[PDB]
Structure formats: C-alpha cells, structure tokens
Design a protein around this ligand. Sequence first.
Ligand code: H5K
Length: 265
Amino acid sequence: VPFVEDWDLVQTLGEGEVQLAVNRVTEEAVAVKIVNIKKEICINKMLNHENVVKFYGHRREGNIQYLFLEYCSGGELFDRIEPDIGMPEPDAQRFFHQLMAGVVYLHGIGITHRDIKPENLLLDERDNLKISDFGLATVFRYNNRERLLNKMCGTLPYVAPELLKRREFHAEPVDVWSCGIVLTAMLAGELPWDQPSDSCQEYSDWKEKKTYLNPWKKIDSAPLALLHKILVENPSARITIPDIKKDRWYNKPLKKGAKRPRVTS
Ligand SMILES: N#Cc1cnc(NC(=O)Nc2ccc3cc(C(=O)O)ccc3c2)cn1
C-alpha cells in the first residue's frame, strides 16, 4: 500500500518534544517523542499492558531518536485534578485501580518506573489510565535476583523518604509511595509536602498524625486509612500492592460503569 508509512506532525503534546502524528493514509494518531534513551527504548520493547503506554517502534535519523508511542486523547491525569479540590472520589478510585494494575504489571516483569506523578499518567478516549515515560525507568529484577537501587531519581514531592535518607533501597516500595502521593493529589487537589524529610514541617505533621490539617482534612476516613498504610516512612513496614488490593476503600463500591446509551417505555 503506497504512502502508508507517512505521518504528518500536526501539534505539540509536551516537552526533547512530544508531537501528535497522523498517518497520511489510515489517519491513525500516534505520539512521537523526538530526543538513558537507549535504556528507554529497550525497556519500552519489553512492555505490553492495557494501563502502559504502547510502544510501536523507533527510528534514528543521525543524532535524533524518534519514539513512536501511544496517543492518549484524554491528556494527562494532572489536568483532571482541580487545584485545592481534586476530583470526585469514585473517579480517583477508578484511576487508582488502573494505576495499580499498571504498576503490578511492571513490577511483575521486574521494571520500576521511578517517576510516577499525574503528568506521567495519560488518559485514552475512554479515560483509561496509561503509565507514560520510561526515561527514568530501570530493571530491578533479573534472572529472579533483586537489585537494590541507589540512584536519586524522580520528582521531590513524589519521592519516598528512603531515597533521601538511605544509600540503598528496594525499588517496589518507592513506586508504591509515589502512587500514594498521586492518590493524595486526586482526593485533595494539593501535594502534602515539598519533600518527605524531617526538615519539612508538613511531613513532620503527618508523622505526628495531625490529619485535621490540609490536605488530609479534605479526604474521607476510608481512603485516608489507605494513605496511612502507603505513606509509612519505613519502606519495610509500608503496605505492598497485594495488600492495597485487600484495603477496605480499594474494594468499596462507589462508581457506575461507562455511561451506556438507553431508551425508555
Ligand atoms: N514519554 C512519553 C509519552 C508522552 N506522551 C505520550 N502520548 C500522548 O498522547 N501524549 C499526550 C500528552 C499530552 C496531551 C495533552 C492533551 C490536552 O492537554 O488536551 C491531549 C493529549 C495529550 C497527549 C506517550 N508517551
């Protein structure tokens, strides 16, 4: 079929730069990342899951790398969070379920994302969450042997406290912590602290269980009981994903399915 390989760059999606590309023949939309990168391509080739941004391929034009990735028309989860309000609790529970499925998948194949935040969680046309950007990602389990991490990666308001206090740490509780900060942002529309350190007053208040303060006072007791188990300073005592899936709020019926068309009489 002629011209089937031609794509037109129609608009900017993010910033390296991310462009929306449309196929000249089929009109299929893809996101093109125009660029660490060698590792991002290698990790992306391992990935295949409904809550993980799809990798279609790559092309190297001299010094420039072109990553052909899934287009998510709903944009970033970040723009679904109303500042200081958040979003309706049933929406946050659905986004959190899909975030857990995506992270379970990644950890299962021994990959840690290391930069989970709402800017990296994209939504398709049906508002299905997709974990995006594997530029900071790494392999923490190979040949069934766990590798402890030591590199400083992520975004300070979402990083686990052990990444700041310890030389080495396990990879999985770090992604669990950032998911908990994402859950906090979705339910309160604010970040609880700048960084999880003792020098940070907001972080000390949380360890002192002052939940009458913002953002915790905006969060219902059931999802807050979950946050009490995720945002635990000691990563060895922090709730694992199998146990998040057994939490009372995680399994609380709150939301109806996608609106489906119907007529009466
Ligand atoms: N790395 C990476 C990466 C970045 N973007 C990917 N896909 C994608 O569709 N990106 C975006 C990013 C921002 C967007 C923002 C909007 C919007 O603000 O309306 C709509 C669609 C968007 C789509 C896929 N992988």
